Design a protein around this ligand. Structure first.
Ligand SMILES: CC(=O)N[C@H]1[C@H]([C@H](O)[C@H](O)CO)O[C@@](O[C@H]2[C@@H](O)[C@@H](CO)O[C@H](O[C@H]3[C@H](O)[C@@H](O)[C@@H](O)O[C@@H]3CO)[C@@H]2O)(C(=O)O)C[C@@H]1O
Ligand code: ZN
Length: 1280
């Protein structure tokens, strides 16, 4: 296997495993460096990397080299032999840790055996050349001086110490004459600057961090394996260059940084390889395959070596052959074997990745290449087995530090590292100035957004299709379990000897590095995320602060700090009290904090949004000036797009035309030139999707990431300000007082910190949801548009080609070109990534029924708009009446209609027909004098057709019908018909909930949650349902006909009885009571009274007494056999009067638990409903009389709602007053016995009783109770 050699810096040079090397970039001059062979082909040179850096660049200065690194400097690292030795023994411990597992061992075995080819592009094909700076390095044998005797050796890797920045490790490849052999299939001597003690830190949980350090530090063994992978790539010459991801740097808020090549993202692995589109994934693949082709060609022509005649040609042809896995026939002719080439390429690109390795060694690491990095820490002593071991790293089981990566946790394993002198770090910043007053922001914190230039246009080219053309897919994945099982991977071919002729051609390009201003001053007067966060901090030389809800004073005054929490919270926080009241005050301001932070779990179900964090806007004011107005509302309208700081310009090209041309003649076999044109279409879809996912991850999800982060900081700064205030108020008191104040600062932070954690969890689900939403509604659809377009153009491309050829199949193989293109590829994120976090975001998004809404009509600023997020066009004509209660009216006028142009690029169409339509509706009563036309005339109210196919909602009298029409013209229906011979109906002219669902076998109609009708729709063919939707009364309707609708919406999936019952309860909910028809109950409005327990009964002021008698309602008197009902406009006319408010009398809405006066009219006076305060019985006739203030009667009533289920009924409770919990009883109707000298009978009266009090508490709620009322005002939908 792999042998890790041992030695000490002070060991003597022997010119074998301890030498005096003359590094490549030395150009063969300057001086020599003592090097050690830690394993075959691998050397360690324990000295600073100085090639290309000015000796001064090692000190901390006004500059920085890299823009995204908190750079630590220290020129004294490795300035002694004892340090050089420690560096050595540390490197040794690391390689041992690397080989401690099969996986890292295979890495090393691959790096040792992957010897650089002999020569590069310049070397003739038939030759070998060891005399080039990328193949040979020189060792010195002289003693008193240089030059005297120089020997040459081969090497695969030289690891130096760090350059100017300790924590900026980097693998470097050799360039000669503007070219890189490590990028052309040859490979070449690799170099590296590595530092083991100064590791990077990445953000993550560590306690709950509202006081104790947060984050985890890296295992230097993974940091070295990350670098070795670059080495591997270099050695095999596949570290090719291609179209990089480049940051957009046009806006002041965008992160400036170097371009990022695929090789770096492939090395990290995880989700990062998804940012490299499938088009580029293939570009690279092809360039590497092309390189190997050249190498396999050389092996077939190589004969002599004109550099070291000592070189054995056969020995080398057998090594390279095994390196590259070429196949050698029985004659010796070398050739590329696609399968082996494949597994090898994937192994080097997707097998050995920092993600797969960390998982294997059980080491924690950063989630993505694009993730905020914290400042570095110094590991105290990697040479101490109590702190770090070969087998386990920092996560040692004996110290119970294996679980949860505790060994790398900063808040837990503080004996393992040291914080570093910030007075030694350098950070590239952007000083954001106005116009006086500027703010420094670390480039790290800005938004990273991939410019459009970052993505390939290869999708717009053409494709010659032939019987040969096959599919091309590079799965950015490789099963690491088999890679750990030796068969192919590791080479058992002898490794040639490292000694050879000396290097004499020291030609080579040596990179020069220079620093650049660390601070970059830019100008802008905007106050977005960065400013709002700054507004929440304060200087260290200030201990006395006060909160303000005003962003501007906060910026102006140093002792003023901005808070996005409530006005109430802010007032209490700035409170100042007596020591005797400090405890209490602390207890509540912290609880307040907790309650405010938890407002991040706010629901908004009525607007079809399950999760919403109302304060995100005030907190960051990110995107579309979100700190102004009501955040919840604005989100409800534009959605996740208002949170984005920048709306990116996507790259969605026209998929290049096809050509099946190049293939004629009457060959009935090459026919597959079409069969391959189809599967190639599927490749074009997939690739387009991958193109999208790639832009989403680097232009959209990156921005959301910055928001989740900004919220973490925002919430933290908040707790910090609060703790600062608390501490100040406490220390104002004398020691005598403090001693008696019961305060536990550890419980304060604990509680403050717990709240933040609960919030972050909410803020996270919220933001991920948006990100996915923006993916699915503002990105995927646009991609579908072009694919459905390419489809068409491709449909005419084909067919016509089945025409230009011959032949029976020509017909049965033309249908094949139909049934295929009639199937669009469903987007599935799991196809382009395997990152668990992402997959979970996506699965969570597809499991929320609400995300299935493709149309949701809502009133907003006197117009109806689609809020689904798919941007349906909504044209609302003049004949339509709208109110802010979301009710719209459709009349008989030709201009009373709504036209909706559905989004044509959404999924909805597929074999089965799966979607739902939900809405509320009020259908006016029939005119008694036209019952004939009513029951005979059927009229459409919502029509959605295309090519004579689609769905339709119509009404014929008392019946509502759902109708389906497939392309062939076949029709099926289903309907709900409400009886019109009921004394009192629950549907006629009353608002009710309709829901229609369709699966592959049934069309079901639900009314108010319950299922009323079913219908088999198997026979039904395809039903085109994405045509224009026309809302309008169309048919032979009466001039007086009208309809009221509300909350109209569509789901592209069948809703379940559960989802329906829930939608019903959600939309039914209101803070107010309702009247008989289902509309808001109102003050100062005439109403007749209905009793839910005595349907056919009404109240009337008895002639000779202050009581309301109860009479039988009169009914429909005409001679119709089709109708029958009870009059509703009968009995006394009541009018609910507000109890409080002494400032005039308008006409507001009646809310639950409201105090009212139940009055009514008698002739030209307004009387009232009273109760005798002293009845000793359980029930008593109510006392009805003129308005007055008598101390013997209760006049104040409380309107309540005991039912927990949807109902238009309500109850009237009599209480002592507005506080006592003393209930007098409920208003209802009672039956009494009467015996006088002439009449003996029973009669019911307007009663009040205690008996109802306990009855209303039972479950399920008794809707039949006599204490249940409903108010009926006149209504055009009901004439009698
Ligand atoms: C409408 C009706 O007749 N049904 C209920 C009536 C009615 O709701 C109220 O009278 C008017 O709102 O009430 C019933 O009795 C309860 C109560 O209302 C009165 C009855 O006058 O007292 C009842 O308790 C006692 C009752 O007075 C005595 O005659 C004797 O029977 O003992 C009972 C219990 O100790 C009771 O609280 C009614 O039956 O009259 C209940 C009806 O469902
Ligand atoms: Zn890297």
């Amino acid at each position: 296997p792999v042998t890790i050699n041992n030695f000490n810096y002070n060991d003597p040079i022997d010119n074998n495993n301890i030498i005096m090397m003359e590094p490549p970039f030395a150009r063969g001059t300057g001086r020599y460096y003592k090097a050690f062979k830690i394993t075959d082909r691998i050397w360690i040179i324990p000295e600073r990397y100085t090639f290309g850096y000015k000796p001064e660049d090692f000190n901390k200065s006004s500059g920085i080299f890299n823009r995204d690194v908190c750079e630590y400097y220290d020129p004294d690292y490795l300035n002694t032999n004892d340090k050089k030795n420690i560096f050595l023994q540390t490197m040794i411990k690391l390689f041992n840790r690397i080989k401690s597992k099969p996986l890292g061992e295979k890495l090393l075995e691959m790096i040792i055996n992957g010897i650089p080819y002999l020569g590069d592009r310049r070397v003739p094909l038939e030759e070998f050349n060891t005399n080039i700076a990328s193949v040979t390095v020189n060792k010195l044998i002289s003693n008193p001086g240089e030059v005297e005797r120089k020997k040459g050796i081969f090497a695969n890797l030289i690891i130096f110490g760090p350059g100017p920045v300790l924590n900026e490790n980097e693998t470097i490849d050799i360039g000669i004459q503007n070219h890189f052999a490590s990028r052309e299939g040859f490979g070449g001597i690799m170099q590296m600057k590595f530092c083991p003690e100064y590791v990077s830190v990445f953000n993550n949980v560590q306690e709950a961090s509202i006081f104790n350090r947060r984050g985890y530090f890296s295992d230097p063994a993974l940091i070295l394996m990350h670098e070795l992978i670059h080495v591997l790539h270099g050695l095999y010459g596949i570290k090719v260059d291609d179209l990089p991801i480049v940051p957009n740097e046009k806006k002041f808020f965008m992160q400036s940084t170097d371009a990022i090549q695929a090789e770096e993202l492939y090395t990290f692995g995880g989700q990062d390889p998804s940012i490299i589109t499938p088009s580029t994934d293939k570009s690279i693949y092809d360039k590497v395959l092309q390189n190997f082709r050249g190498i396999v060609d050389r092996l077939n022509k190589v004969l002599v070596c004109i550099s070291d005649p000592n070189i054995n040609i056969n020995i080398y042809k057998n090594k390279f052959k095994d390196k590259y896995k070429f196949v050698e026939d029985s004659e010796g002719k070398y050739s590329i074997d696609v399968e082996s080439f494949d597994k090898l390429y994937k192994s080097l690109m997707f097998g050995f990745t920092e993600t797969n390795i960390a998982e294997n060694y059980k080491i924690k690491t950063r989630a993505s290449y694009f993730s905020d990095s914290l400042p570095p820490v110094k590991i105290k002593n990697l040479l101490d087995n109590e702190i770090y071991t070969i087998e386990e790293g920092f996560n040692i089981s004996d110290k119970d530090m294996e679980k949860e990566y505790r060994g790398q946790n900063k808040a837990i394993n503080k004996q393992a590292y040291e914080e570093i002198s910030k007075e030694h770090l350098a950070v590239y910043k952007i000083q954001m100035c106005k116009s006086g007053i500027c703010i420094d922001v670390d480039n790290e914190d800005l938004f990273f957004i991939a410019d459009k230039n970052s993505f390939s246009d290869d999708l717009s080219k053409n494709e010659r299709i032939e019987y040969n053309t096959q599919s091309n897919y590079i799965e950015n994945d490789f099963p690491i379990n088999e890679l750990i099982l030796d068969t192919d991977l590791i080479s058992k071919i002898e490794l040639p000897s490292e000694n050879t002729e000396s290097l004499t051609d020291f030609n080579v390009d040596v990179p020069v590095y220079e620093k650049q201003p660390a601070i970059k001053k830019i100008f802008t007067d905007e106050n977005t995320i960065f400013q709002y966060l700054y507004s929440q901090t304060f200087p260290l030389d200030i201990r006395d602060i006060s909160l303000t809800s005003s962003f501007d004073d906060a910026l102006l005054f140093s002792n003023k700090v901005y808070s996005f929490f409530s006005m109430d919270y802010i007032k209490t926080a700035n409170k100042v009290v007596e020591a005797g009241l400090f405890a209490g005050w602390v207890k509540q301001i912290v609880n307040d904090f907790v309650i405010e932070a938890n407002k991040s779990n706010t629901m908004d179900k009525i607007a079809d949004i399950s999760l919403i964090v109302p304060y995100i806007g005030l907190a960051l004011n990110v995107g579309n000036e979100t700190a102004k107005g009501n955040f919840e509302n604005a989100f409800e309208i534009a959605g996740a797009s208002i949170l984005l700081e920048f709306i990116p310009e996507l790259l969605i090209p026209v998929v290049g035309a096809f050509l099946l041309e190049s293939y004629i003649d009457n060959k009935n076999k090459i026919i597959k030139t079409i069969d391959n044109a189809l599967t190639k279409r599927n490749e074009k879809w997939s690739d387009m999707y991958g193109l999208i996912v790639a832009q989403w991850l680097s232009t959209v999800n990156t921005q959301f990431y910055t928001i989740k982060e900004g919220m973490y900081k925002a919430l933290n700064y908040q707790a910090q300000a609060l703790e600062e205030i608390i501490k100040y108020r406490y220390n104002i008191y004398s020691e005598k007082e403090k001693s008696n104040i019961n305060i536990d600062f550890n419980d304060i932070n604990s509680k403050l910190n717990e709240g933040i954690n609960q919030a972050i969890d909410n803020i996270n689900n919220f933001i991920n949801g948006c990100s996915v939403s923006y993916l699915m509604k503002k990105m995927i659809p646009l991609a579908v548009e072009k694919l459905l377009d390419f489809d068409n153009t491709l449909k005419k491309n084909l067919l016509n080609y089945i025409d230009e050829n011959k032949i029976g199949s020509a017909e049965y193989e033309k249908s094949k070109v139909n049934k295929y293109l009639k199937t669009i590829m469903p987007f599935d994120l799991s196809i382009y990534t395997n990152d668990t976090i992402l997959i979970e975001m996506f699965n969570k998004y597809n499991s929320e029924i609400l995300n299935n809404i493709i149309l949701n009509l809502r009133y907003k600023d006197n117009n109806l708009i689609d809020l689904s997020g798919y941007g349906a066009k909504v044209e609302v004509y003049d004949g339509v009446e709208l109110n802010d209660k979301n009710q719209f009216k459709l009349t008989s006028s030709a201009n009373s209609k709504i036209r909706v142009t559905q989004n044509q690029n959404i999924i909805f169409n597929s074999v089965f027909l799966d979607f739902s339509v939900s809405f509320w509706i009020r259908i006016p009563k029939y005119k008694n004098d036209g019952i004939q036309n009513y029951i005979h005339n059927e009229y459409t109210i919502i029509n959605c057709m295309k090519n004579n196919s689609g769905w339709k909602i119509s009404i014929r009298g008392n019946r509502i019908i759902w109708t389906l029409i497939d392309i062939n013209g076949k029709t099926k229906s289903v309907f709900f018909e409400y009886n019109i011979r009921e004394d009192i109906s629950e549907y006629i002219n009353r608002w009710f909930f309709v829901t229609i669902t369709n699966n592959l076998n049934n069309a079901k109609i639900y009314i108010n949650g319950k299922l009323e009708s079913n219908t088999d729709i198997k026979d039904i063919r395809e039903v085109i349902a994405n045509g224009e939707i026309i809302f309008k009364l169309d048919g032979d309707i009466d001039r007086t006909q009208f309809i009221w609708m509300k909350y109209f919406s569509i789901f592209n999936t069948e809703l379940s009885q559960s989802n329906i019952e829930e939608r019903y309860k959600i939309q039914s909910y209101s803070e107010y009571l309702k009247d008989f028809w289902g509309n808001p109950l109102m003050y100062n409005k005439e109403y007749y009274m209905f009793n839910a327990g005595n349907k056919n009964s009404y109240i009337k002021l008895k002639k000779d007494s202050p009581v309301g008698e109860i009479l039988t309602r009169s009914k429909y008197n005409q001679n119709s056999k089709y109708i029958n009902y009870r009059d509703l406009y009968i009995g006394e006319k009541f009018i609910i009067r507000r109890k409080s408010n002494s400032q005039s009398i308008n006409d507001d809405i009646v809310r639950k638990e409201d105090y009212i006066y139940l009055d009514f009219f008698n002739l030209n006076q307004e009387w009232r409903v009273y109760t005798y305060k002293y009845f000793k019985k359980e029930e008593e006739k109510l006392f009805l009389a003129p308005i007055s203030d008598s101390d013997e009667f209760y006049n104040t009533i409380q309107i309540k709602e005991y039912d927990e289920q949807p109902t238009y009924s309500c109850q009237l409770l009599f209480k002592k007053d507005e506080e006592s919990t003393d209930e007098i009883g409920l208003i209802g109707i009672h039956r009494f016995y009467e015996s006088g000298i002439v009449f003996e009978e029973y009669k019911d009266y307007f009663c009040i009783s205690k008996w109802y009090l306990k009855e209303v508490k039972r479950k399920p709620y008794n809707l039949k109770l006599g204490c249940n009322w409903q108010f009926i005002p006149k209504d055009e939908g009901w004439t009698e």
